[PDB]
Amino acid sequence: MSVSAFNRRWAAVILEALTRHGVRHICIAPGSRSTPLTLAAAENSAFIHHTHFDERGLGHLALGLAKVSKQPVAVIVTSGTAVANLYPALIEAGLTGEKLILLTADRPPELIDCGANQAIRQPGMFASHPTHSISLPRPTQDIPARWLVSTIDHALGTLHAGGVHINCPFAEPLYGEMDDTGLSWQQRLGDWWQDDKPWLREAPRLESEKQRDWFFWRQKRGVVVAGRMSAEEGKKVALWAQTLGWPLIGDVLSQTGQPLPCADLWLGNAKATSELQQAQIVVQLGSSLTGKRLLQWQASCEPEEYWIVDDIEGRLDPAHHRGRRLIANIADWLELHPAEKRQPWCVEIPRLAEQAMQAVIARRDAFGEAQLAHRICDYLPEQGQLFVGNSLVVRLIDALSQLPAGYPVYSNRGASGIDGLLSTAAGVQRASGKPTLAIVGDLSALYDLNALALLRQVSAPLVLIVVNNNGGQIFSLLPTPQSERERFYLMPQNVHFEHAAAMFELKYHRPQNWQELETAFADAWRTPTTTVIEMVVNDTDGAQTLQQLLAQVSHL
Amino acid sequence: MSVSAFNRRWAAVILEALTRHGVRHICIAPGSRSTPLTLAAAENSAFIHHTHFDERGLGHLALGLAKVSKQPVAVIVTSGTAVANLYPALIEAGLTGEKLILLTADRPPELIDCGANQAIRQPGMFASHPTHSISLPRPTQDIPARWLVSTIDHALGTLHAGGVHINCPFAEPLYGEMDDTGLSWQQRLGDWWQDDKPWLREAPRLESEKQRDWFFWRQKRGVVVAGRMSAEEGKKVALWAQTLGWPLIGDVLSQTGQPLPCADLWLGNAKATSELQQAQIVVQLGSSLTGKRLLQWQASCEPEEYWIVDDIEGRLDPAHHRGRRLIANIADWLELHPAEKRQPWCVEIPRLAEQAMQAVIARRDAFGEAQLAHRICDYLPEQGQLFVGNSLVVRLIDALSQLPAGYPVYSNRGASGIDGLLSTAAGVQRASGKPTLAIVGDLSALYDLNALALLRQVSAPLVLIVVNNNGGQIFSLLPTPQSERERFYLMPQNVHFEHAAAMFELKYHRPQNWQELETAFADAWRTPTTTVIEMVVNDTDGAQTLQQLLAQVSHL
Ligand SMILES: Cc1ncc(C[n+]2c([C@@H](O)CCC(=O)O)sc(CCOP(=O)(O)OP(=O)(O)O)c2C)c(N)n1
Ligand SMILES: Cc1ncc(C[n+]2c([C@@H](O)CCC(=O)O)sc(CCOP(=O)(O)OP(=O)(O)O)c2C)c(N)n1
Ligand SMILES: [Mn+2]
Ligand SMILES: [Mn+2]
């Protein structure tokens, strides 16, 4: 009888199904057409609910929650451009593996392509970027609940990584009293409603087999490259490489402790690349390598075999080496391919790395973004986590700092967009409840400015450092043409962030020197709130300091 | 030989080709992969260049420019999530007709699906939303320039309406001095380079034939419904309806002068629906009707025939009436189907319309958003234009005000997104150079907050009224459930906009009464800058006032 009531019962099956696959967090944006999903979610006690008004920011909030928690995170939006705004976060999830379940409300079929308000063609609108796409039919009791739950269960159960687009059409009426319409339809699932398992259990595991010739290859001269992995995996990789006697090139994203720090500098020295030419195998664990010199060495090296171990699917070597692409949990993979103690084979590179770090330390005093990057270890919150933005900051920390082994680092380095960094950081914080240091550039902060609304709600202190060098100064590091550089690349916006902080009642500091910065941090970690720290630096100093250190270390 | 030089020669052909199709404005976001396109655009004197750091805002800026100028507008962005952020504006263009030419830089094929930084699958990523999609090949001199320009000319020449996605892969190196690589390849186009015409002229016109039985139908009892159309078309439709003696129901977007104003109120009166039951034909010109009562009457009416005349393609009647869907320029269509002088047949509705407007006038004094909407016709800038936002404001003006015939009104009412209203308003202002009044809600202003950066640059005064009723109070108008309403629908953010204005050095006023509002207006119109006027109102007053007026008029 009641369409409004059946809509809600149809939606309740969808939401309850998700709880059987570890969905705990659900992020919801406002709308009318999404009513059946949103009310089902609100009524379901299994969920932690997050809200936001900008669906692009909502998608990145969900991304951050998923990134840290390692469980699927659901999103509810209404029909129309609300759905399109989820694209950036979905694309990033497709590259780095976050499980985002996008529940996108839709008009019913009879209201598509007829000029109806807020009605667009939604099935397939994210093309190949979701791992799975479900285009649900117009709700009807003539399709059994067991079909609906089974379709959800197949999508979630078989999900190795990445997003799922579930398009959910609903016809009006959407509002009205809840009657018994659809109760017997639901009850056909019997005591599944009281169960904690999926209706259909379909959970194949995707994993490469052990490499049986590892105990041959581990005897050879090898290099370990560590990219993005978990904080615990970083510690395990550091011990493993040390035991192998192989040099470990550790990315800022690796949490290995970077025992040969400043690789972006010393990989520029001919003595280093000459010694690495002796490598017969490279075993890379993790991916999304940060530094230019590392990417260039990776592209140029010619070991007999190149292996990449990661739980991400697909090719991960942009230089297309002869070798192996091994899909595995990194910690599990290390157990299956253990190290045996062996004399180290590198003799020159440890010296060069020490010399490289000494060159950076010699330049630590100037109050600039290169020095902030170098020193950032001194400002990490205890038992906290770091969220590192894109553009210069991730490159500077990677090149100039040595981050502690096992200290959690998070980032958006799949597609490396500057469009969702504040909202992602908010999700990273909420997921773990840890004190968080997030560092972003000024254009990045402007891009996601309204995410400061989300940052009014954190469970532990969050410090947002905005490095304001007046534009995208990565384009002062790149050899962009001088005539067009300011207008068409740097795009200085000539703003500060004190009023932004004030709008959202966030504490704000603009430290002028190292002492003021240390005071600002000591202030900030005291309460479970977000503090904005704006570091104003001269436009090109960071880029130029990196360039100078590169040159200096190359001549060592 | 030089890859960087040839990249730029390939791009130069693309950009110069666009000048032969009326492209004057180009909107550019920052990046490296986009270098060939951006430098080709920058060097070409034919263009006016606009920049912005948020690609979602950039798309909407281009939308606003296209909306007013009625010419194609180009957009350049770099690869990755930058491209995804264009989706909302592209979808809106697809619905309302703006010609947006999206030049999306891409990695070359050898860097896709291999874990390379900022590389994603871009061809087809907008699915069916572009009118035309071009996936350009990896640049090479082995494909002649005549092919490249012909492909562009086909897409632009045959473009009736909506967006074009042109995906543009470029391999590194991207930077370097320009040499003669690709010069002889370009010169194969000969004096096309000096021409004002396309290489291939392909421009078939899409248009419905003259209706041969119009002289029969124009003598019947007809109703004219006017939706979105140009300001000049609105004046012509008003005269045409008046001549025929047919009642004209005119949308806020119609610029007809709304001779039977407050239709959203008087269509709720049974006597008006009874009189309209006598209508034998409904001729609707334009689409995207605003008001609920009008959409309800449209859905219930059963004239012998229902016609919709508009220059947008496809079905435009969400009630699927028996009738005709006629594709034409509305002005041309009226000339082809002229009015005959006939006696008006409606008697009751003119009475009701006057009584309805009197009911609204009686409540004009309170300092609320309903009253602002009613009185907005008194505050329109001389020789200016109005940009109306979504949610309550467009509904309140449509229901409560009578806007002058021929006074330009602009909006985003295809998909009615609240995600790009500020950036669109900026483009609307820049394209015409006219003084502009823009009115939006608080969640809408927060959504596109960083577009205040764009509003620092307007060519005539722009008044941005932000109506702050603390949340999306359209959900206090809709029968949303009270228990979940605040957290999951209204989502109050409890902010003001004084600091937002200050951040971007915009003048700001928060008037407490009508005198202060009028003082703010008078001052704002004196300089070619943006003034932010925040009207703080009681949350539910606007929605309740509309409900009350609906009830009162229904009982007349
Ligand atoms: C959504 C989107 N659209 C455009 C871009 C292009 N893009 C970049 C990629 O080239 C770099 C990706 C990376 O880190 O690898 S970096 C950059 C400027 C950032 O300026 P900033 O925050 O002030 O930082 P600073 O440069 O240190 O001063 C841009 C605009 C993008 N990434 N994402
Ligand atoms: C991108 C996106 N995502 C979500 C929505 C859903 N949505 C709406 C559509 O349902 C109504 C469209 C219309 O027809 O006008 S209106 C609305 C609230 C806006 O709040 P406000 O600015 O403070 O204004 P007020 O309600 O008058 O107080 C939302 C959140 C959307 N439209 N677009
Ligand atoms: Mn910057
Ligand atoms: Mn509001």
What DSSP assignment string belongs to A149-167?
HHHHHHHHHT--SS-EEEE
Which tokens go with A47? 């969920």
B30, B52, B419 ranked by CB distance to A85: nearest: B419
Q: What is the DSSP letter of A137?
A: P
List, as one string, the DSSP characters of A286-353.
Answer: S-----HHHHHHHHH---SEEEEEESS-S---TT--SEEEEES-HHHHHHHS----------SHHHHH
Q: What share of chain B is helix, strand, coil (3-state, %, to 5)?
A: 40, 15, 45
- Within A72-120, strands assigned E span 73-77, 100-106
CATH number for B1-196: choose from 3.40.50.970, 3.30.70.120, 3.40.50.300, 3.40.50.1100. Answer: 3.40.50.970
B391 Cβ inside 6 Å of ligand 2 = yes
Instruction: Say if residue A172 is exposed, middle or buried (CB neighbours under 10 Å; 0-12, 13-18, 19+).
Output: middle
A114, A446, A449 ranked by CB distance to B316: nearest: A114
CATH number, domain B212-337: 3.40.50.1220
**Segment (H or E) for B77:** strand B73-77
| Placement of tokens 């939401």 in the chain | A15
| Amino acid occupying residue A412 | N
CA distance B3 to A355: 37
Secondary structure of residue B100 in the 3-state scheme: strand
B82 Cβ inside 6 Å of ligand 1 = yes
| Amino acid occupying residue A210 | K
* Nearest-ligand number for the alpha carbon of A441: 1
Q: What is the DSSP letter of A512?
A: S
Which tokens go with A501? 């902080």
Secondary structure of residue B50 in the 3-state scheme: strand
| Amino acid occupying residue B282 | V
Work out how many CB contacts closer than 8 A connect A with B. 243
Torsion of CA B542, B546, B552, B556, to 10 degrees: 150
Q: Are B368 and B423 in contact (CB under 8 A)?
A: no
Q: What is the DSSP letter of B383?
A: T
Residue nearest atom 3 of ligand 2, based on CA coordinates = A82
Closest Cα to residue B351, out of B273, B266, B243, B252? B266
B441 Cβ inside 6 Å of ligand 2 = yes
CA distance B428 to B362: 34
CA distance A440 to B95: 36
Helices (H) and strands (E) in chain A, counts: 23, 17
Q: Are A440 and A421 in contact (CB under 8 A)?
A: yes
CA dihedral over A141, A144, A147, A152, signed as positive or negative: positive
Instruction: Name the strands in the sheet holding B385-388, side by side, starting at the edge strand that comes first in the sequence.
Output: B409-410, B385-388, B436-441, B462-468, B530-536, B507-509
CA max distance for chain A: 82
Which tokens go with A40? 């089902």
φ and ψ at residue A326, rounded to 5 degrees: -110, 115
Q: Are A209 and A164 in contact (CB under 8 A)?
A: no
For B120-156, the three-class secondary structure string (H helix, E strand, C coil) is CCCCCCCCCCCCEEEECCCCCCCCCHHHHHHHHHHHH
**Residues 74-103, chain A, touching B (beta carbon < 8 A):** 80-82, 84-85, 87-88, 91-92, 94-95
Q: Are A183 and A151 in contact (CB under 8 A)?
A: no
Q: What is the DSSP letter of B209?
A: P
Q: Are A8 and A183 in contact (CB under 8 A)?
A: no
**Segment (H or E) for B502:** helix B498-503
CA dihedral over B489, B495, B500, B506, signed as positive or negative: positive
| Amino acid occupying residue B111 | L
Interface residue of A44, A503, A532 to substitute, partner B, most B CBs within 10 Å: A503
φ and ψ at residue A409, rounded to 5 degrees: -120, 135
Angstrom distances, CA of residue A118 to CA of A121, A369, A475, B33, B414: 10, 45, 39, 34, 7
CA dihedral over A525, A530, A531, A535, signed as positive or negative: positive
Secondary structure of residue A496 in the 3-state scheme: coil
| Placement of tokens 């629906």 in the chain | B273
CA distance B95 to A531: 42
**Residues 455-484, chain A, touching B (beta carbon < 8 A):** 472, 475, 478-481, 484
Residues of chain B with CATH 3.40.50.970: 1-196, 347-556
Give the gap in angstroms from C-alpha A201 to the nearest C-alpha of chain B.
Answer: 31
Secondary structure of residue B282 in the 3-state scheme: strand
Does residue A327 sit at the B interface (CB-CB below 8 Å)? no
Helices (H) and strands (E) in chain B, counts: 23, 17
CA distance A302 to A296: 12
Residues of B in contact with A503 (CB under 8 A): 495-497, 499-500, 503
Residues of A in contact with B499 (CB under 8 A): 499-500, 502-503
Secondary structure of residue B99 in the 3-state scheme: coil
CA distance A131 to A154: 12
A426: left (phi over 0), alpha (psi -120 to 50) or beta: alpha
Cis preceding-peptide flag for A173 (omega within 30 of 0) = yes
- Within A176-322, strands assigned E span 222-226, 248-250, 281-285, 305-310
For A391-444, the three-class secondary structure string (H helix, E strand, C coil) is CHHHHHHHHHCCCCCCCCEECCCCCCCCCCHHHHHHHHHHHHCCCEEEEEEHHH
Which tokens go with B229? 């159309």
Q: Are strands B281-285 and B222-226 parallel, antiparallel or unpaired?
A: parallel
Which tokens go with A37? 């999903």
* Nearest-ligand number for the alpha carbon of B476: 2
CA dihedral over A193, A196, A197, A198, signed as positive or negative: positive
Neighbouring residues of A467: CB distance < 8 A, sequence distance ≥ 6: A369, A372, A392, A393, A439, A440, A441, A442, A535, A537, A542
Cis preceding-peptide flag for B173 (omega within 30 of 0) = yes
A174 Cβ inside 6 Å of ligand 2 = no
Angstrom distances, CA of residue B269 to CA of A422, B249, B279, B350: 50, 15, 17, 12
**Segment (H or E) for A82:** helix A81-84
Which tokens go with B179? 């040499």
Nearest 5 degrees, angle CA A183-CA A189-CA A190?
90
Radius of gyration of chain B (CA): 25
Q: What is the DSSP letter of B489?
A: I
Fold of A347-556: Rossmann fold (3.40.50)
Q: How many angstroms is it from A391 CA to the middle of ligand 1?
A: 5
Instruction: Name the strands in the sheet holding A132-135, side by side, starting at the edge strand that comes first in the sequence.
Output: A48-51, A25-28, A73-77, A100-106, A164-169, A132-135
CA distance A381 to A434: 9
Query: Residue B493, Cα to own-chain centre: how many angstroms?
Result: 27
B110, B419, B450 ranked by CB distance to A449: nearest: B450
Instruction: Say if residue B411 is exposed, middle or buried (CB neighbours under 10 Å; 0-12, 13-18, 19+).
Output: buried
Q: Are B90 and B153 in contact (CB under 8 A)?
A: no
Which atom of ligand 2 lies nearest, measured to the CA of B446? 22
Size of chain B, expressed as the number of residues it contains: 556
CA distance B79 to B170: 10
Which tokens go with A409? 């680092």
What is the distance between the terminal CA atoms of chain A, rounded to a whole angstrom? 82
Closest Cα to residue B145, out of B185, B181, B178, B194? B185
CA distance A222 to A241: 9
* Nearest-ligand number for the alpha carbon of B78: 1
CA max distance for chain B: 82
HSE toward the beta carbon, residue A123, CA cutoff 13 A:
12
Size of chain A, expressed as the number of residues it contains: 556
CA distance A515 to B424: 44
Torsion of CA B502, B506, B512, B518, to 10 degrees: 170
CA distance A298 to A319: 7
Q: What is the DSSP letter of A124?
A: T
Secondary structure of residue A75 in the 3-state scheme: strand
Looking at the DSSP bridge assignments, the partners of residue B100 are B73
Q: What is the DSSP letter of A449?
A: G
Q: What is the DSSP letter of B218?
A: T
CA distance B275 to B284: 18
CA distance B257 to B255: 5
φ and ψ at residue B285, rounded to 5 degrees: -115, 125
Which tokens go with A167? 């398009």
Which experiment gave this structure? X-ray
Mutational test site, ligand 1, from A474, A490, A534, max ligand atoms within 8 Å of CB = A474
Secondary structure of residue B540 in the 3-state scheme: coil
Query: Residue A38, Cα to own-chain centre: how many angstroms?
Result: 26
CA distance B473 to B462: 25
Mutational test site, ligand 2, from A51, A118, A175, max ligand atoms within 8 Å of CB = A118
Q: Are B475 and B465 in contact (CB under 8 A)?
A: no
Q: Please, where are the H alpha helices in B301-453? A: 330-336, 348-361, 369-375, 392-400, 421-432, 442-447
Q: Are B251 and B289 in contact (CB under 8 A)?
A: yes
B338-341 long-range CB contacts below 8 Å, 24 or more apart? Answer: B338/B240, B339/B218, B339/B239, B339/B240, B339/B241, B339/B243, B339/B244, B340/B215, B340/B218, B340/B219, B340/B243, B340/B244, B341/B243, B341/B245
Q: Are B437 and B419 in contact (CB under 8 A)?
A: no
CA dihedral over A465, A468, A469, A475, signed as positive or negative: positive
Q: Are A451 and A460 in contact (CB under 8 A)?
A: no
CA distance A478 to A68: 32
Q: Are A449 and A464 in contact (CB under 8 A)?
A: no
Which tokens go with B156? 């632009």
Q: What is the DSSP letter of A173?
A: P
Q: How many angstroms is it from B83 CA to the middle of ligand 2?
A: 24
Task: Give buried/exposed letters for B373-408 (b at 16+ CB in 10 A, else e).
Answer: bbbbbeebbeebbbbbbbbbbbbbbbbbbbbebbbb
> How many CB atoms within 10 Å of residue A194?
6
Residues of chain A with CATH 3.40.50.1220: 212-337
Q: Do B320 and A42 touch (CB under 8 A)?
A: no
